[PDB]
């Protein structure tokens, strides 16, 4: 039961290294559903991938305390309740909280969870822009945005915060080195 907290920039395959955990070991591993106001993506589902709520009940949720931690992102909120967690761990299964790194900072600040971390890097921060360029989806200004913060991450990471830190450059590659981490079991 010591939670893992996985952080790492998005356009890392760090989705895909998920998915292919949960599907590998299905009985195992329960993710963190986080709540955030932002609108759903196609292929999202309510309950699963994110609790879509309303800005009126995440203020709600944040003068009760149900968070473990909560931030703002882009100007719409995130964040890990207490009541997502907890679940998981009373089903008997390892939570895995996928959440930035102002989440693993936040995380980090609660001795009790007794949390592991695990970040998943890029192979380089211009790969990592190639591949928001190919994307085709964001703009020069978001881009720019995204490669600072994957900067500041890569910076935090070498102040050892992070228990094992995982370059993605070869998903199978990669997913034998998550493996191996997560069941050594501390
Ligand atoms: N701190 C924190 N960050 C989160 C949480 N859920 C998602 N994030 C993040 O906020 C960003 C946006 O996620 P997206 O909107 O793509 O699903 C990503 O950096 C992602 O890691 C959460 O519960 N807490």
Known sequence: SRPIVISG??????????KKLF?????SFGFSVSST???????????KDY?????????SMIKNNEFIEWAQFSGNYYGSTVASV?????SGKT???????????????????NARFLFIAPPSVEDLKKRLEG???????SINKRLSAAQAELA?????????????????????????????EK
């Not at 920039?9 to 998920?18: E, F, I, Q």
């Not at 599907?23 to 009985?27: G, I, K, R, S, V």
């Not at 106001?37 to 309950?47: D, I, K, L, S």
């Not at 994307?135 to 200004?141: A, L, Y």
């Open 156 to 184: 935090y990471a070498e102040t050892g915060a992070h228990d094992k830190v995982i370059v993605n450059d070869d998903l199978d590659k990669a997913y034998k080195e998550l493996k191996d981490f997560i069941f050594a």
């Open 9 to 18: 920039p998005s356009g890392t395959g760090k989705s895909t290294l998920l």
């Open 95 to 113: 939570c895995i909280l996928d959440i930035d790194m102002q989440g693993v900072k936040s995380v980090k600040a609660i001795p009790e969870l």
């Open 86 to 90: 907890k679940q998981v761990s009373k």
């Open 23 to 27: 599907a590998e070991y299905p009985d």
């Open 37 to 47: 106001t932002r609108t759903p993506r196609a292929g999202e589902v309510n309950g």
């Open 51 to 59: 609790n879509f709520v309303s800005v009126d009940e995440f203020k």
């Open 135 to 141: 994307r085709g989806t964001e703009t020069e200004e």
